[PDB]
Each structure stands twice: as C-alpha cells, then as structure tokens.
Design a protein around this ligand. Sequence first.
Ligand SMILES: Nc1ncnc2c1ncn2[C@@H]1O[C@H](COP(=O)(O)OP(=O)(O)O)[C@@H](O)[C@H]1O
Ligand SMILES: Nc1ncnc2c1ncn2[C@@H]1O[C@H](COP(=O)(O)OP(=O)(O)O)[C@@H](O)[C@H]1O
Ligand SMILES: Nc1ncnc2c1ncn2[C@@H]1O[C@H](COP(=O)(O)OP(=O)(O)O)[C@@H](O)[C@H]1O
Ligand SMILES: [Mg+2]
Ligand SMILES: [Mg+2]
Ligand SMILES: [Mg+2]
Ligand SMILES: [Mg+2]
Lengths: 48, 76, 52, 532, 183, 364, 528
Amino acid sequence: LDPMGGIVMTNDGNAILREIQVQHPAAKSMIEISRTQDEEVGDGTTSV
Amino acid sequence: ASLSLAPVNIFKAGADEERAETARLTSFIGAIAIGDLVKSTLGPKGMDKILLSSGRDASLMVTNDGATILKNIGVD
Amino acid sequence: TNDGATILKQMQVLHPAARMLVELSKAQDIEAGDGTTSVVIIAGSLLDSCTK
Amino acid sequence: PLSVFGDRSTGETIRSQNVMAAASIANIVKSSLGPVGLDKMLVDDIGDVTITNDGATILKLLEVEHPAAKVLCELADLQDKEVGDGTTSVVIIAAELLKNADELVKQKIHPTSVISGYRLACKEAVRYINENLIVNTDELGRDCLINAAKTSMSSKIIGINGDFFANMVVDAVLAIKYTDIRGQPRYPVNSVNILKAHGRSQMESMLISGYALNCVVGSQGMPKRIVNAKIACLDFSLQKTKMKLGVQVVITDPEKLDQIRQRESDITKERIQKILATGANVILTTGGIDDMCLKYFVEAGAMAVRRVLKRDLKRIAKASGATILSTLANLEGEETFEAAMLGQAEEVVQERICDDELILIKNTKARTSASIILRGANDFMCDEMERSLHDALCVVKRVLESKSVVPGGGAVEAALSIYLENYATSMGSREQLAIAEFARSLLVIPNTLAVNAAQDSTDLVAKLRAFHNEAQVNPERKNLKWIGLDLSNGKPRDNKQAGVFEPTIVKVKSLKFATEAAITILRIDDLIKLHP
Amino acid sequence: EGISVNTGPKGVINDWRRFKQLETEQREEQCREMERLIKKLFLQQYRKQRMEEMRQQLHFKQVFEISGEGFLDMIDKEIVIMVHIYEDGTEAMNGCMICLAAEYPAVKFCKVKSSVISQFTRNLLIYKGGELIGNFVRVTDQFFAVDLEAFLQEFGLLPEKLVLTSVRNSATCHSEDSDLEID
Amino acid sequence: VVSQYSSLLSPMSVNAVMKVIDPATATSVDLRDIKIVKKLGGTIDDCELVEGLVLTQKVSNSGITRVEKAKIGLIQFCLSAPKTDMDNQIVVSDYAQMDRVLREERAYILNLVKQIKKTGCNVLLIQKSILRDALSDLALHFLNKMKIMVIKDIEREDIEFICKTIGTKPVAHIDQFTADMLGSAELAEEVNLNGSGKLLKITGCASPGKTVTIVVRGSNKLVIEEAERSIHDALCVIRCLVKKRALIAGGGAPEIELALRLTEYSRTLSGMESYCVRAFADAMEVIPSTLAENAGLNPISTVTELRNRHAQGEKTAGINVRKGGISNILEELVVQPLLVSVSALTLATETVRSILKIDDVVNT
Amino acid sequence: MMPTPVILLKEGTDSSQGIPQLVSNISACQVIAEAVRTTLGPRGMDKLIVDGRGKATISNDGATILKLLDVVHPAAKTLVDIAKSQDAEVGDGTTSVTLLAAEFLKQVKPYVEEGLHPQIIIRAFRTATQLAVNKIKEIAVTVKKADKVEQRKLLEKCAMTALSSKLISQQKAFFAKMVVDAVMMLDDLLQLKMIGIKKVQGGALEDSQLVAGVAFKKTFSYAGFEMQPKKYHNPKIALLNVELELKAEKDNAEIRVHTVEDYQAIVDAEWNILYDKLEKIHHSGAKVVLSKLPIGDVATQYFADRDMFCAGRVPEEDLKRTMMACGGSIQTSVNALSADVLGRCQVFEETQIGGERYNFFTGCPKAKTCTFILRGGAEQFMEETERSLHDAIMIVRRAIKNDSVVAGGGAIEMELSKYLRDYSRTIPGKQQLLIGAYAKALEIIPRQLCDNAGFDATNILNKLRARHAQGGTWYGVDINNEDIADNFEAFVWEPAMVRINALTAASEAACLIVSVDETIKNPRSTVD
Ligand SMILES: Nc1ncnc2c1ncn2[C@@H]1O[C@H](COP(=O)(O)OP(=O)(O)O)[C@@H](O)[C@H]1O
Ligand SMILES: Nc1ncnc2c1ncn2[C@@H]1O[C@H](COP(=O)(O)OP(=O)(O)O)[C@@H](O)[C@H]1O
Ligand SMILES: Nc1ncnc2c1ncn2[C@@H]1O[C@H](COP(=O)(O)OP(=O)(O)O)[C@@H](O)[C@H]1O
Ligand SMILES: [Mg+2]
Ligand SMILES: [Mg+2]
Ligand SMILES: [Mg+2]
Ligand SMILES: [Mg+2]
C-alpha cells in the first residue's frame, strides 16, 4: 500500500524492497543492493 | 561603595536599602505628609475627616482627633 | 588575540568607565600602535589609587 | 564587576576544556587508522548515508561547536588540501601534542617554554627525517609507486584489491604527466575524471585510455559511434538567434517580417553549416542545442552533445588538440571556422553502463588522458571507492614529484621518538621536558595502529622502540631504521623490504601542521563567550 | 516622583539583557506565527491529468518533518519553501507533496505539526525569499498529485521543469589544475 | 604568538617600513602603503615581502600565465557593445540591418582590441563595472587571440595602490590609451599556493613605487589574523621610531624609574598633593609587578630588587625573563620607542582626569 | 541496534562499557581530587559549601568537604568513601588518600588507554603497596626508652604537625600542649565521649581553656535559683537520675477517697513524699545536686533555703562526664545516698563566659575527663576549631597506642618513591612500567605542597629526588624557607599508621576503580 493510495501487488523482490521505508542505514544499503541488481541484469533480485 | 550599589549583591530578594540623601528624602516626605494630613483639623475652625475602612466591616468614622486619624490609616 | 585594543573592543563591556578605557586603548593604538595593554593597566591602577 | 554580557572561563578550567575538545575530536577518528582500521557510517538529519574512512570527510560532515574542535577539523581539511593523505594522523598527533603540553603546563611549566620546545622538536624532527629516514625512489623502479599506492589504499574499501587498483592508479597518474617550463615534470591529478556507476564488482573498474563524459548525445537520430572523430569544442549555445537587450525590432512595412523571422534562425543555420563543412564529426558545446539544430547534426551524420561541463570540455580540448571557441569571429570581422581548430580522437563511442549511457572519447591524439570508471555494489560503496582512489592518486603524485619516501607503519614515529628523547638532554632545562613530551606524543601512531588490531600495544611498541634505539646507538646497525609494525601478524617487520612506503611530504607537513595547531590552541588561557 | 533614576537600571543591565534576549526570541516566534495564524481567519474533464499521473510515478525519500525553533531557523536561513501544517485529509496532502518533491528538486517541500507551533488546531504555508507568497488555507475545500500541481500552477508558484545520469560525476569544486601541455 | 617566528618577521617589518618612506625628511609613515594579504595554508614560515603587488583576482584569460617583460595597462572603460550614457535603442526594420548590427558590434570590439594591442600592452587590468558588461566574451576571445593576459574585476579603491606600485596611469577612454600610460614590469606571473589558492604576483617594476606587500600564511585562520595583528604592531613600532626618534629601555625599567623618581618628587611637595603624587608613583609601580608575575617570579621581591637597583643608579636595569631575575636589559636587546611610554602615560592621565570630573549618571 | 519489540532490560537503562568508561571513571576521580586539592599543607585554604537550606560550612578537612559534596558518580563515590574510611580509622590524612588515589588512576590512565589488561595493573598496585607498607614499617623511627618526658614531647610534636594546616595554626603550640594534656587524662580506652568540647561565642582563640574537671551550660533554672549560693569550697556532689517535683505517683495511678479527711491526707501525703526525697538528699551532706530529670520549683526553693545548689535536666553525657571526673555514681533512687555514691571536687563555681552561664567543677585529682571551652568569633569558626582539635586528638590517641613516627612534608613519600623505583628497576619490564607509575604518583604530595605554597614545584622535586638518591631519608619540603630541609630534625612528625592506612586505602580504591569494566544505571523509581 503506497503513501499515494495505490496498491502494488507483486512477488518481485525489487518492487517489494522499493516500496518499503527504513531507518537503519544497513537496511538502506540492502535496498540499494536490490535496486542495483535489478538495474544491472533485471533478474536475481530476491536471490542477492 | 554602597551596600546596594556594589558589583556583588548583598541582600536577600526584596530587601531594599536607602542611603543618606534618599533616606532623608523619604523620612521628610513621610513626616510632611503626616503633618499636612493632621493639620487643617487644628484650632477652633478645624474641619473633620471621614475615615472609610477597607475591611469587611466597612466601618465609617468622622473625627477631629489627630490620634484617631493617625491610628486608623495604613502607613508604610 | 593578545592585542589589548582588540581584546577590549571585541568584548562588550556595558559600563561607562569600561567604555572610556576601551576608547583609551583605541587612541593609544592610533597614536602609537602598541602599548595598548599598558595604558589601560596604568589607567586602572591610577583609579585604584584614587579610591583610597 | 566586569559587566560583560557573557560567560568567562579562565586558567586551568579553559585549558582543560580545550584539551577535552581536542581529545574528543581525536577519539572520534582514532578507530579508523591503519590497515586494521574500520569505516564509519554517517547519517544526516534527512537520512543520507555516508560510509567513509577518510578523516577529512568525517570531520567535515560532523557538526562541531567548540572552537578548538573546529581548529582540529580545519587542520584536517588543510592537510587534505595540501597533501591529500594523513588527514587522520595529523589530527591524532595534534591532539596528543595538546594533551602532553597541557600536562606539562599543569606542572607549573610556563606555556611559552613548552611552545619553544615544541618548535625546536618539530624542526629537529623534520631535519632528522630528511637526513636519515628518507629513501630515494630512483633505484626502486616502478615497484616504489605500486607499493606506495598499495600502502595508501590499505585501510580502505579497495584495500584488498590493491594488487589491481595500484596498477590502475599508477597507469592513470603516468597518463596525465606533463613537463612545464624550467624542466620538471608536473602531474595534474584532479584532471583524471572519476566516474562512478554501480553494477559489476570492483574488479570490473575500467581505466579508459582517453576521456569519459557523463552525458549523452543530443538526439536519437545521430549515430552513437564514430571511428575517425574530428572533435569540435564550442563554448556558445546553438539556438535561434535572439537580438540583444539594446536592440529592438520595429516594423513599419509589414513585408519585412517574414525576412526578419527567417534570418532569426538562418543565422544559426549558417554557423552550423560552416562548422559541419569544415569536416567535423563530434561537436561538444557548453551551451544548449535546440531541436532545430539537432536536425542539422542528425542529417550531417555527426554527434552533437549539449550542456557539457566547462572543465570536461577544457580537458577534452587539451587532450584532443582542439581549441575552445566562445565565438566564430576571426581577426577580419567575419564568421569562420578553420579546420585547424578541430581536435582528433581515433574513436568516440557511447557505451551502456548499467542501464545508463556515457560517451567514451578513446585514444585522443596530441596528448594522452585518463579516466576511471568505478563499479561497486551501490552508491555508498562507489563513493568510498572514489574517495580512497583520490587519496591514492594524490599519494602517487606526491611520490612522483618529490622522489623521497619513508618507511610506513610507525617506523618514522618510533625513530623520531628515540632520537628526540635522546637529543632533548642538550637544549635548555624546561624545553628539555617540552621536547621529551613531543617525542612521547609522536608515539601515539604506533600505539593506535597496534590497539586497532587488538594486539599487545605496549609490548609491540616496546619492541619497536628497542629496535630503533639499538639502531641509533650501534653504528653498523643502520638497516634497522626501517623496522615498522606488521599488523597482520603483530610483530615488527622491515617495512622497507616489506614495501610499506609513504611520501616524505606527508610526514613533514603533518608534523608542521600539527605543531602549529597545538601551539595555537596552547597559547590560550582565557575564554570570553558573549551571549548572542 | 521625578526620580530620573541614576545608575539604578545600570546595576541590573546584565539581567535586563538576559531577559531581553529571551523576550526577543519569544517575540520573533510570535511574529512568525501570528502573521498568518489569524490574519486569514474534451478539455474540461482534464484528459491530460491521467497522463501526468502515470508520468509522475516514474521516478524515494520523504518530506522533512520539523519544533518551533527548527521551523524558525529553517526558514530564517537560505528558492520556494513549502510548509505543511498537519495534526493527527492530511494523508492525501502528504502523498501529493511526496510525489511533487521528486519531480521538482528546486522546491523545498516539508511538513510540521501545529502542536509545536485553539482555533487553528481544530480547523499549507508557502514561502519565497523569507516571505509568504502562497495564499492558500484549508486546501480540503479546494485529490491527487495532479490536482495539487494544477492548483499551484494556476497561481504560478511551481517553478517550470531532467535526465537521469549513471549515479554521479562530481567530487569537488576547486582550483582546476586541469590538463596542461608544455614544450 | 609569532614570537617564535621573530627572526623572519622582525627584518620583514623593518624592511617593509624602510621601503615605503624616505629615510631622511620623513616625519610619519603611511601604513596604508603596506598592504597585508592573508592566504590560508602553509605555516607562518611562508610569509613573504613581495616587492610588487599581489592581486587576489584570477586571470580571466585561461591558458596564458607568467608573461615576462610585461607591459601592464589599466583601463577604466568597458570592452563591450557600444552604449551611450543616456538611454539608447537600436531599431531594426529590415533583415539587412539585423545582420549589420552583429557585424558592426563585432567590428567595434575588434577595433578596440586592436587599438589596445597596438601599444605593446600584454597585461590588461580592467576596473570593476556594475552598469554595463566590463569584459564581453567576444572581447575576451579577441584579447586571447592577441596573446594578452586579461585581468578583470579590479576594485575601485585599489586603483590608487596599483598605480602607485606598478606605475600605470589609468585610462578611461580608448582615445587616450597610449604606450606612455603603460607600467613596464619585469615579470607578471600567476602562481598557485600548493593547492590552497591562486595568487597573482607582479614582481619587478621599472621605477618601482613606494609600496610593499606582505603575504601572511598560516595553518588556520585565527593564527593568521593574530600574525597580521602582530606584524601591524611591529610596523607601528617602527613608525613610532620614525617620528620622535628616541629609544628607551623596556622590561619595566621606565615604569620603576618613574615610580622611584615620582616618589622622590612627592617627598618635596606638601599637603594633599604630595599624597596624590605618591599614589601616582605607587600606581606606576604596577607594570613591573605584572611583568614579574606571569613569569613565575616572585612579584614583590622582584619589584623591590628593581627599585634598589635603580636607586643604585642603574637606569637600564629591568626584568629578565630569560634568566629569571634582574639584570641589565640593554644587553638583552629589549628596547622600545619613547613615544610609546610617553603616549601611554599622557593618554592614561588624561582619561583619569576626565573620569574624576564626573559625579552623576543619567539614563536617557 | 534494533528495536527488539520486547526489550531485555527496563526502558531507560543506561549502560557504558569498555575503555571509554574506565577513562571516564579516572577523569571523575580527578575531578573529586581537584575539589579538595588546595586544602593540603600549612598553606592550604578553607572551602565554603552552602547547602540547600542556606547554611554554610567553612572547612579544611578533606573528609568533611567530600561529605558535603553531593557526589553521585559511581566511580567518584569511592574516593569519598576512602576519605571517610581514613577519617574513621586514623583521623588524619583525609586529603592525602584522595590525592594519592586520583594520582594512581591518572598515572595508569595512559596504560589503560592502550589496552593493558586491568588485572596486570591491579597486581602491580598490590605488589607496590605491600612493598611500600613493609618499607614504612621498616624505616619508621621508634623510641624504646619508656621516658615520660620524651613521650610527651613526641605527642606534642605530632599534634603540632597535625594542627599546622588549620586556622588555629597560629596558636598550634598552645593548642597542641592543651590537647596532649587532655588525652593523657583518659584512663585506658581513650573514649572520645570522655573529652567534652564546648563552644562559646565571643573571645579570642587564646581565651579557650581546658577544664581539669567538667563544665556545662546552665540548664533552665527555675524560680528561686538566684537565691542559691554560687560557689563552694569542698562540695559533695549528688549525681541523680530523679524527677524532683510534685506530680502523679504513676501514670496509671488513681486515687479513690470518700472522706474529706482522706482528701487532706492524700494531699499531705504527696507533699510528704516530695519532702522525704528532698530530706534524704539533704541529709546525705551533698551541697550540689545535678539530675538528669527535671527539678521542680518547689525543690529549687527547698534547696535554696538550705544553701544548696540544684540543676535539673543535665544532659546524660554531661552527667557521665561529671561521674568520671568527680568519682560518684548516678543514682535513680535516693533511698540509700551513701558517701560512696557522692562526687567530690575542690571548687564548684557558676561563672559567666561570653554571655552564657556555665557551671565549673575543678580541682578533681582523680578526674578521668576534661572539657574544651572554645572561644571564637562565629559559629563556623568554633566548628572548624573543633574539627581541627578532633584531628589532633585522634593523632594523639593513635600515637599513644604506639610511638612510631615518620617525617612529614613529603619526606616519606619521596623515600618510598625512591625505594619503589629502585625495586622496579630489577623486574622483567611489564610490571616495571606500572611500579614506576606508582612511584611517580607517590610524588604528588610534595608537589601539591609546593603548588599550594606558591613554590616552583619542579625544582623542589628535583632537589628532593637528588637528596634522597644521594643519601638522606627524612628530607621534605620546607614551606617557610622556600626550600627543602630535614623534616625529622624540623619536628614535622606523623604516626606511621597515617601513611600506612593512606597507602592501603588509596591502593584499594584504585584497584576497585580499575577492576570495573561496565556501569549500568537502572531507571529511577518513585521520582515524585
Ligand atoms: N521449476 C523450477 N524448479 C526448480 N527450481 C526452480 C524452478 N523455477 C525456478 N527455480 C529456481 O528458483 C529461483 C527463482 O528465483 P526468482 O523468484 O526468479 O528470484 P528473482 O526474482 O530474484 O530472480 C531461481 O534461482 C531458479 O533457479
Ligand atoms: N601494510 C601496512 N603495514 C603496516 N602499516 C601500514 C600499512 N599500510 C599503512 N600503514 C600505516 O597505517 C597508518 C595509517 O594510515 P591511514 O590512517 O589509512 O592514512 P590516513 O592517515 O591518510 O587516513 C599510516 O601511517 C601507515 O604508515
Ligand atoms: N610544618 C610543615 N611543613 C611542611 N609540610 C607539612 C607541615 N606540617 C604538615 N605538613 C604536611 O601536610 C600534610 C597534611 O595536610 P593536612 O591537610 O593537614 O592533612 P591531610 O593529611 O588530611 O592532608 C602532610 O602530608 C604533611 O607532610
Ligand atoms: Mg526471477
Ligand atoms: Mg607591544
Ligand atoms: Mg591514508
Ligand atoms: Mg592533617
């Protein structure tokens, strides 16, 4: 459930990690890792 | 160096002090006020004063006596 | 800083005699350039003797 | 009786407060020293994350309120500016110097004597370093550069991959070499464009034998690769011509409006016609290009790039031999463009880098230039790679400019401590104590190096001091000057043979700056803080 | 009565200024709050707004949540600054600010509760150059990101509109020491 | 604080004063002829005494630096499109005029640059302008093509100093820009301060002016400001030597001699004024106590020893911090001009007399 | 960290651990020592502390200053505790203990900061302290002569040394002689409660006196008291614990009579009971009557008619002291008032001292007590005089226990430092640095003396070090002569147990502080 009111319904790793707000800097690093994996090759986002 | 006019404060809160000229001024002002209050009640043609008490009793008195006038007033 | 004039001017002193001493240091700086600490110390000592 | 609207701390109170502030600043960064050092994570108020080991970066990002702490932070910044390495060692040395100097002052030693002793000790330390501990790099060949780079990149995110990053750095620095007047070589680091992009591992970081632009071609129509490139560098926008503020168009005969409007764009059309007719293939301009002119560039089969950075354009023009043209005006009052103003590179391509593209101007002639593309796991890792890489580039520049290096791992500090504690017996009576405390303060670096590795700091530093003392006393044991600390095994080691070097300028500038900062803080004995 | 007091207040100028600075801060806060606190107390169906919405999701961070001192000194220093007052239709406003902030890096979207700043609490402040240029109160009467975008562009408060690079290029700005070539 | 860097700064200050005045027929020193330039970075050991002038402005003409046998020209007009003093507009009603406007503006700029170059000028200083553009891009390009190092944004207040140093005469209209108005210099070079900044230095001038420049370097800003203040104090002291050329010992010797002699003088008076003069002498005795203090010396015993030595006849006996005792200080080379002690005494006495004539404070 | 929805400890629990908390503890101990540094030596200065009620406390004693400081730091409370411990066990050295403990901690701080294991430091401290105590016991000077005059001189010199740091140091010889006289009259247990200390405002310090007997303030005389004679030349003193006034015989007693004759008989019976008690007192031959319980007006007048003296409501301690000074027995019953239970003194007098009336019992050859009547200008003046006399009294008692002395003024500290450095020079080297740090820390006392006196501490320390190294055991700081001198020949003497206990307590405090690695502070309960 987005802050904008929309609903993202998926099992893709990158989307799930992208629509989540975190405060711990290590969690931010992990989110950035998910985005990097998605952008570089597009697959294996959950595995990484 | 006066007791009140010194860089270090030597008194409790609210404790005042008045040096020579100020003390003389206050004493003379008080004495003159009292004398002007009681006078005009002097001599065969003196007039009376009305004393309205501020207390709950609100007692009313009219008098020509200096002692009675001075006794029933708030003096500071 | 160690400059007497700079020290005196930098800090607000709020008292008339203190301000006159500050401007004394300024004047000594203008005419001489150094000795700004000595002149203020001398004025203070002179007034200290004036007390007694 | 002062009647000053503000606080006032005097004497031992303010002296101890200043020492407290400096020691706190030191203890902030003391844990990021040496190969067994560890990075720090800085999180701003809005939530940005910065993972770094550089002391200058940490001290710059941190909010600081005490003036002495500000002095040490600015000292680290200055050390970063003038040298580029040792930004943590300088802060640690300065804070230890203040601590020991204040301890001396508390013993009723006058601060002036302490300051004089510090000055004498600093001068003697610099002289002894320059006369005894320096190693000439002439006979060491290329291995000295690689080893200096590897030493500088230890304690960094790219520390383990030093075997590869050091070759990369040395090649990049040697690429930008140039000799100026009066016949000495100068190495203009910061002319190496460092481009970051997450993606593949660190080992896929590329050294471009050319220049790398972080931009894209203007239009999709123009080709993304040109083999024989004739670069034309321009410093003016290519748009419809708009007359200046002092000129206004007033029409009284309506028949002239069409001609006016036609010329309004025909002027730029003719300029581009000249530029393309000279034979140009690649056009880079700092100004913008509107779609009308992009159409000419597409039809001509040439690449046009807009909004190029000024420094990037200057570097491209210098490397390729082109000349920046802010206008098309010759010395006879005409619009023209000679072919001699065209730079040349043997290939200009637009490569895709992790779902993004950038122009790679490869192998420019008339000059060799270098650029570095860093690949990391995420943005934070790439930023730390860039910072450490800049540290290494600065170190290699210092080594190549001044050809003297000194052993690393606290060998210099221990040798200086021994020599200074020996030499202090001859100067004065209280500056004796000052110089002895300077020598003791110099020993904080090996202590911190050892304690960061969870080794026996006391025993290790005692062994190192014994080695250096025996080297200084015994005439024929001068080969023990290079004994430093091996933190991987926790034993003293010949650092000259181990390949642990650093430029002499780092140590010398660090000592001078630390001594001056300590003197500046120590000169204070009263603080007035006016109420805002 | 005619005291013409001599060096009387002089002996207490330190305390007088001690309270003077505090009352100056209090009056600064009061002036900042009160200046707006009570002073105010087919093309027709927007065919293109759906396209603007679907372009808006294509990019994330969050708006800055501010006490009173923070609100004062954020606008006192340093562009258009938008301040949203909320207490807990604020969710829709927050979403609109979140969506608009990314596409307009120049603007300084931020929000702050009214608790840290009783008629105002029960029932959007826009700054520019330290002075209020926006003139909107109770935006509930007159929603998505396109609604706020059109509402602000009607009065011309949103600066006019960027490509996405790899990650970044710049490291520092200082003396050039760029490429040089000498004989 | 720069007491450690004294062997470098004392001769620097003396030379700075002696290079801006005539040794004879000089009764004052204008300290505004000694410009102090502060540049962060380095240490105080890097302070310099540049003979020419140092400009913080950067060279607009990138790529050309360090011109030798420079012929500096300083202009006060603007190198841009023509613009009259009163409001002017150009009306275009035909495309021919539309092209001719650009053509003629280019021709005008080219003629300006050609006239400037014809005089042999190779360094150009341009005064700062706020109304119209002082240096257009076309003008800069033309000047670069002619190999002229262009320097813009020169402040208005610095014109007098620049003209006094280099020898350039300002030019306000191109009709008057001739070779005679050019200040020939040996070298005009732009240098970098080891990554801490860029300084523009014009060293070596035919017929140099009576100005010098002191460049102060330091590791932090605060020590730089204090070094500037200390250098200013040294220059002011040398100026105090220039006017009222009289030298006396320092180290508290004049103060203790004043105390002793004034006590003796007060013995010869009578009444309350004798008491006042004796108190004046006792107050003068303070400075030797302060000098004895702050040095680890016993103040009262040191002052008594000084007074005894002066009564013995040693006018130059003073406090010796190096030896931690009392000795002749002229052997320690501790001297100060007479117009420091005299000025301090006179000003302090004036202020005391002024304060003593005050009996009330009124708040407005 | 992570939120951990259900946390381990209570919310708000504060925990600090590692080297930083140890360094913080050392710094806190430094602060506590600095709070009392300037009170050490003959040049020491007093400290004034105002409580929350506005009452001031001008003091020089280190233990008193530390107690008046509301120290809440867990590590810093150890210094206050060891100061109080030294005050209780010995009575002097309450500043030296804190200075030594803080100096030990400061000296080991550099070694702590580099990761040295605290157990090593603790072992080094224990070894150095036991060696130093053995050395003190070895080199302490004792006189095995059983000479009473020599012992008295030793006690007077020790008391003078103990006193020459307080505001009564100007009259230190007079006060020390008086204190030595006071203590020598205690019999075998030297109980402090047997030495009364009375403070009377007004009068110079030299007007203070020691009473060879007992003296106490007049206690609420009733009507008819002024008719009693106020001087007796061989009185017999009746020490009683008896209420002499008309009152109910018992609280639960009730009288039930049904005849007016019985009513009159009961009234006369109460009167006869009181008069029988008074007559039994009078026929005992006593002339002075002191009672713990109130003595009524009827008894006062009865005694006045018989030329007797009465004083009721005498405090219990004063009655016990009168017992021990005169040689009687406190009687709760007057039925058997023999001559065995009656006190005796040469002279009793009721004189005036500075606006107060005092009863004096002098001329008691068999007295085992005394009384100090201190005169001063202010309440805090007499309080601090009492504190100084307490320090001197404890020193004299401890010296009575054993006449083993060492020279003061840092002489013993310098000798111990030299010995410990010499020992540390002959050990492998990890312990050598720590024992050398201990020895260097032992030099704080002469350094603090010089700093307080305004000396140049470094030169005095160098001279002392050279003198001790080249031979000379009792060389310490000479305050008046700006220099060093043989303190033993200068009669700067202290009992050895003072330094022994100081070293022991300082070492224990330092070891306890170093041994702690973590501090945990639970959230407060019932703050209200
Ligand atoms: N039919 C299957 N049987 C067994 N393993 C499978 C099958 N399909 C996929 N997998 C494995 O399961 C994993 C699925 O990962 P996936 O959900 O695609 O992660 P991501 O979305 O991050 O790529 C892959 O590693 C793949 O090897
Ligand atoms: N391989 C190594 N072995 C031993 N010591 C090293 C090694 N590499 C670096 N050092 C030492 O570690 C110290 C700390 O370096 P570092 O803190 O990373 O540089 P900076 O001070 O610029 O941050 C340097 O003084 C260096 O001598
Ligand atoms: N006449 C004296 N000269 C020098 N030092 C003295 C003299 N008398 C006492 N001292 C020193 O003063 C110290 C005691 O100071 P004080 O504050 O009185 O008690 P404490 O032992 O509690 O500090 C002792 O160490 C002693 O050596
Ligand atoms: Mg998948
Ligand atoms: Mg001076
Ligand atoms: Mg480094
Ligand atoms: Mg004592």
